[PDB]
Structures are given as structure tokens and as C-alpha cells.
Scaffold this active site. Structure first.
Site, PDB file in Angstrom:
ATOM      1  N   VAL A   1       7.814  -6.795  -8.212  1.00  0.00           N
ATOM      2  CA  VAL A   1       8.781  -5.793  -8.656  1.00  0.00           C
ATOM      3  C   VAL A   1       8.917  -4.722  -7.578  1.00  0.00           C
ATOM      4  O   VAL A   1       9.119  -3.544  -7.891  1.00  0.00           O
ATOM      5  CB  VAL A   1       8.388  -5.105  -9.984  1.00  0.00           C
ATOM      6  N   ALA A   2       8.775  -5.103  -6.312  1.00  0.00           N
ATOM      7  CA  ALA A   2       9.043  -4.204  -5.180  1.00  0.00           C
ATOM      8  C   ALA A   2       8.243  -2.911  -5.368  1.00  0.00           C
ATOM      9  O   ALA A   2       7.034  -2.976  -5.634  1.00  0.00           O
ATOM     10  CB  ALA A   2      10.556  -4.024  -5.054  1.00  0.00           C
ATOM     11  N   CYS A   3       8.868  -1.736  -5.265  1.00  0.00           N
ATOM     12  CA  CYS A   3       8.146  -0.469  -5.220  1.00  0.00           C
ATOM     13  C   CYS A   3       7.336  -0.202  -6.480  1.00  0.00           C
ATOM     14  O   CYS A   3       6.356   0.551  -6.431  1.00  0.00           O
ATOM     15  CB  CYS A   3       9.139   0.669  -4.990  1.00  0.00           C
ATOM     16  N   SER A   4       7.714  -0.789  -7.605  1.00  0.00           N
ATOM     17  CA  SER A   4       7.039  -0.509  -8.858  1.00  0.00           C
ATOM     18  C   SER A   4       5.978  -1.536  -9.189  1.00  0.00           C
ATOM     19  O   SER A   4       5.419  -1.483 -10.286  1.00  0.00           O
ATOM     20  CB  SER A   4       8.049  -0.428 -10.001  1.00  0.00           C
TER      21      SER A   4
END
Lengths: 368, 366
Positions: A153-156
Site C-alpha cells: 500500500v505504498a506510503c501507508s
């Protein structure tokens, strides 16, 4: 109740790239490009490229330096990517090696060993290969028995990964190892003044346990949120070969201005609703561990949720030293400053960025 | 109680029969073996070997497969589908398939977008790293909540089902779980021992906290991983930085070692799970197993049930779909869940790369 982050770990590569080295390197690339394409400049056919500087980078973000996997190739204005070598299947992959180092530190800090862990989650913004999962590679290098999977979920990814860790504990897992390995220099575009300074390399890990008798941050409430946006995107993937892809968009692309507009009010609204939900005020929160992309964004979000006169000190900044490490950011911050929270005090972990994704976690520290 | 209340299925339009595929590879090898004769007779490059529709079917039980684009796969000068880059404003290919499968699963489940709290894309290869394709799927369906991408290759569906249950146990009403497998995009069509294995599909499932909807109630889940290089693809975002050259950026397998390792491992997991749940193999109406090798499923079924267990208990769909990786077990459940009557038990078990095994005991409810 009863689920605690009991240890964190951190690894970063040795080499450091200061803002000035990075600006000096891009200036050279921009200079050479604007010479070679001078006639294409004067014709309006191709767009001229603008240099950058240490002040422009720091004023824009608060970043001063970053750790990187390999320095020469990044600064080499004829390469602009790290100088790496393929490894044989018989050695640890880069991502597995970084993950293992961070994970051993988390485990030692939590006082657990391999036989104590049931789940290994590799949660980050880019996996080195599709299969076998790099999480299973990390799992078996450490000697852990259970199951493992990759999750993006990339940055999260770290806050989503903590929820999934807590969810698996509710279902019977005793202890979860959560690992975030971000080699951002592998998908950053160092040609672009507007994003070349954003990201750094790092690996973090966390041990999440069901316990009422070990020191740690007890997870009280989790709000995850996604809403699709193309304002951060990387179109690199396994079908590029079959598309015979030509568009130059196979690395990090961002409309930084729109992300800033869109995400600040989103994060603050989520944090506030969560605090209301929990019968807490902003002044009950000893530390906000926020995503580490842009200190201005953090100060902005901090001043909304909290008071305008809230102390700088309550939202730690590690991006000055690491730049943005994508999913690892909040864990670095928690790792460096969790010790500043007293027994019984409350904290907020919140990641935000690509996908549009937001994750927000309320925690409370307990000392054993 | 947590229950699978709908499944959905999309496959692309064109079919490649074994004979068409064997014809194509044979064209590739006969021609290659001509271009490199001074090296066949010199010992530096080994002479390549063809195959046949007979070899394919005997080895696996596969007769045909669906693919995203047929001409480029069969074209011996290309040996990969012909696709076009889409723009950011367009549904990506992988989101597009997952939506079609998701809509059917939602209709079969009697739910709309507003009923769904989580969207999980669990499959063997994501089309891009970010934004997550699951988020693109959730958006296009109009679902609110959160979404994420998760990869355990062949077992992604059962691992995904576990995370669906976990998320429901902790407060979610309903999870949409999507598996999209464009295996034609990472298969090696030059290699006679793997070029026939895989097909393309998208599957979806709805999981709900419910005691009132028809579906399969989840009674126990056992997941297992243990690292193995016997199935591996080294394609990745660091390839450029490695200035990579090894010819290993596609699916690669030691098929014999996976067969020996995985078969007893799965039967052991199943058997142990059966004994944990006070069940016998005779209590299991249907075994929905990974859909890679008919002989492997044959042997697993005898490994857990009787020598006398009739093949009806373990439906096969790989004859039509070939190996569809994570989705295979959801195709089998989709095609033959109706064969299980109220109160009867079933077993959903996928297994494969990573070495991963996921196994789920279910019981049907009307």
C-alpha cells in the site's frame, strides 16, 4: 485491547548523499541536457530542464541528506541510478538482507526469538520480485516457522501492516514480525528537480505481540482509508515487456502540488475523527508519529489537529536525515522517539501518501 | 460466522489449444536450432527440444487455456502477448478484469458497492507498484473503505481469504477478494517444460459475517510458507540498477522438485487439519485443490482419502483454464460449489511458489 508493539528495528545503508551533492549532480545533468538540446530549446520542441539547489530542497521539504544503497551511480550524471550487481538465487536478495537486519534488531529489542514468531509481513512500496515472496525469504533466513506474505500500500504500508498484524493476532497468531524495506533509489527519477530529492533508502521492522506483561505501545484504534488517485503513480511492471512500452513513466511520478492540497485535510480529518471516537483531545497525545515526506505538510497537519501553539517537539522529524522513506517513515520516527512517551501516555501513528492511502493508529504506552 | 456468499469469474476471449502452442514452440525451436548449428555441433549452445499436444496433456491434464492476446503468444518471433500501454485515465488491464469478476461475484452474493468495507487484490503479479491496483478496483466499483495489494503467488487466494476473515473478525462487514492472473505476461514460452502450464483468468469472492446467507462458512484455516527457489522469477524494479543480464526474468521452475516437495506437504496439512476439526476424509464432499497438475491432485486425494476416493470429489478445471495460479481454486469452487448440499463439508487448498500452502475447511449453508 492486549496487542502491543514491543520492539522496532532500523537499518540504513552506509553512504550518505547531502542536498548539495544531489543538486550538484542534477545541475550537471540539466546543464549537459540543455547544451545537447540547445537548438531544441530555442525551437520550443523539447522542454528545457531546470536545475535545483540545497536551499530549494530543504525549504521545500525539510530534507537535508538521505542514506542510499549506492552513491556513485546516483550522483554520476551519466547514470542517475545506483550501481548494483545481480545476485545469485543462493544468496539473500538485497531486500531480504535489509529486512533481516532490521528484523533481527526488532526481535532483540522485543526480547523474542525466531520460534516466538508466527507471521512475517513484508509491507512496503515496491517488492524486488514477485515470487517467491521476499517476506518468505526473510522468514526462512531468520528461521521463523509460520507463514509470510508480501503486501503493498505504498506510503501507508506500515500502518496497514500493523492492522493486519493486529488482525492476525486477534485470530490466534501469538506474535507478528512486520518489515518495511524501501530501496527508493531504485524507482526514483533523478532527472526531475521536483522529485529527485524526496526519497531515501532504509529498512524498518516491528514486533507486534499479544501481551499484557511486556513494555510496548498498545494499539487502541485503527482507521485505514483508501481513495484512488493518479497524483502519485509508477507504471513500471511485468506487462511493460508485452506492451512494448514507450512512455517515460516507469519510475516515480507525482503532481506534488495536488498531493499537498488533497492529503493534508484528509489526514487531519481522519485523525480528529479518531480522537473524538476515542474520547481524547489533541493535548492528550504525547507524540504524533507522522509520515515523513515533508515537514511543512506535517507542521500543517499538526497545527490543525492540535493547537496552533503546540510544541514542535510533539511531532518528531526524522526526514531531515533520511529524506522520505515511504512506508518506513513513521516507524523510523517511532523507533527514534518512542522513548520520549511516558508510561500511560498516548500516541498517534499516521501514514499517508500514494494510492491515496491513509492509515491512523492511536496507541498508549505501557511499561513492564 | 463468516461465509463465502458469492464468487465471480472472468476469462479473456481467445483460446490457445495445446496443439497450437506445441506448433508454435516447435516452430521456435526448429528455427533456433537452425540459426545456431555451429554451436550445436560445438557444445557451447545445447540443441533445443520441442514437444507435442500429447506430451502436454499427459504431463498435466491441460487441454487448452484462455489468454489475453493470442497472436503474439503463438508468433514464434515474439512469444508474448501483444498489448498496448493505457493512459492513467483508463482502467488498467488488471483493474479491468478484476472489476468484471467482482461485479459478477457481487451480483451472485446479492450485494452492492455500499455493502463492502475492504477490497483485497491477492494474486501472483501486480501490474504496477503504486497506486495499488486494489485501490483502482475499489474506486471503479465505487466502494468505500480501504484496499490493498497482497502477493503469495499460487496461494494468494487462500491467504487472501484468511485476511478477509481476519478483517471481518475485527469489524468488517464484507470483503471483496479479487485474484487477477495474467500469467501470459511472465511465462517463458520458449521452454517446453513450462510453456503449457499457465493460463489467464480473473476471479473474485465476497466474504461476509452472516448467519442468514447461502454460502460456505469458514471453519478453520491453516497457512504455511517455507522458502524455496524451486519456483522463481527475478524480474523487478531493481533490474535496471543491476544492469541485469541473466535470462531469468520470467517464470522458472524445477518441476520435479516441486512435485516431490509439495504433494506430501499438502496432504500432511490437510490430514492434520481434518483431524483437528473432528472430521474424516469421508466427511469431505468436495476438495477444491490448486489447479496446476491433475496428477498432483490425483495423488494428493489418494494421499488423504482412500485409494478408492472417486475423482468426483476433487473437481478439475485446469483442463480448460490451464494453471491459473492463485485463482485456480476459486475457479473450481465457482464451477462446482453447487455440487455441495446444505450441511456438507468442503476443503479449499491452494499451494505452490514460495512454497506456500493455504488450506481452508468449509461447510455449506442454504
Amino acid at each position: 485491547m492486549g496487542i502491543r508493539i514491543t520492539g522496532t528495528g532500523l537499518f540504513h545503508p552506509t553512504e550518505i548523499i547531502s542536498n548539495e551533492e544531489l543538486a550538484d549532480s542534477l545541475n550537471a545533468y540539466v546543464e549537459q541536457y540543455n547544451q545537447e538540446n540547445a537548438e531544441k530549446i530555442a525551437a520550443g520542441e523539447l522542454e528545457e530542464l531546470r536545475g535545483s539547489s540545497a536551499e530549494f530542497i530543504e525549504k521545500a521539504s525539510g530534507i537535508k541528506r538521505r542514506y542510499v544503497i549506492e552513491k556513485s551511480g546516483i550522483l554520476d550524471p551519466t547514470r542517475l541510478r545506483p550501481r548494483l550487481s545481480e545476485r545469485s538465487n543462493d544468496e539473500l536478495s538485497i531486500q531480504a538482507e535489509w529486512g533481516v537486519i532490521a528484523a533481527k534488531q526488532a526481535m532483540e529489542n522485543a526480547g523474542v526469538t525466531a520460534e516466538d514468531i508466527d507471521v512475517v509481513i513484508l509491507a512496503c512500496s515496491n517488492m524486488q520480485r514477485a515470487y517467491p515472496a521476499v517476506a518468505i525469504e526473510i522468514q526462512s533466513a531468520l528461521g521463523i516457522q509460520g507463514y509470510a506474505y508480501d503486501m503493498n500500500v505504498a506510503c501507508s504500508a506500515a500502518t496497514f501492516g500493523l492492522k493486519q498484524a493486529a488482525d492476525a493476532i486477534r485470530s490466534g497468531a501469538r506474535r507478528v514480525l512486520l518489515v518495511n524495506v524501501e530501496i527508493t533509489s531504485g524507482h526514483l527519477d533523478y532527472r526531475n528537480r521536483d522529485c529527485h530529492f524526496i526519497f531515501g533508502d532504509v529498512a524498518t521492522a516491528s514486533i507486534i505481540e499479544e501481551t499484557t506483561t511486556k513494555t510496548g505501545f498498545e494499539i487502541l484504534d485503527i482507521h485505514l482509508f483508501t481513495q484512488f488517485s493518479n497524483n502519485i503513480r509508477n507504471n513500471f511492471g511485468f506487462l511493460n515487456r508485452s506492451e512494448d512500452a514507450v512512455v517515460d513513466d516507469k519510475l516515480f511520478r507525482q503532481d506534488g502540488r495536488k498531493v499537498f492540497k488533497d492529503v493534508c485535510p484528509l489526514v487531519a480529518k481522519i485523525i480528529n475523527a479518531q480522537l473524538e471516537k476515542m474520547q481524547l483531545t489533541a493535548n492528550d497525545i504525547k507524540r504524533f508519529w507522522l509520515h515523513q515526506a515533508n515537514a511543512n505538510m506535517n507542521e500543517l497537519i499538526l497545527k490543525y489537529v492540535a493547537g496552533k501553539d503546540a510544541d514542535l517537539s510533539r511531532a518528531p522529524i526524522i526526514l531531515d536525515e533520511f529524506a522520505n522513506t515511504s512506508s518506513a517513515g513513521v516507524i523510523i520516527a517511532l523507533h527514534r522517539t518512542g522513548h520520549e512517551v511516558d508510561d500511560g501516555e498516548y500516541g498517534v501513528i499516521s501514514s499517508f501518501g500514494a494510492g491515496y492511502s491513509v492509515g491512523s493508529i492511536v496507541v498508549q504506552k505501557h511499561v513492564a
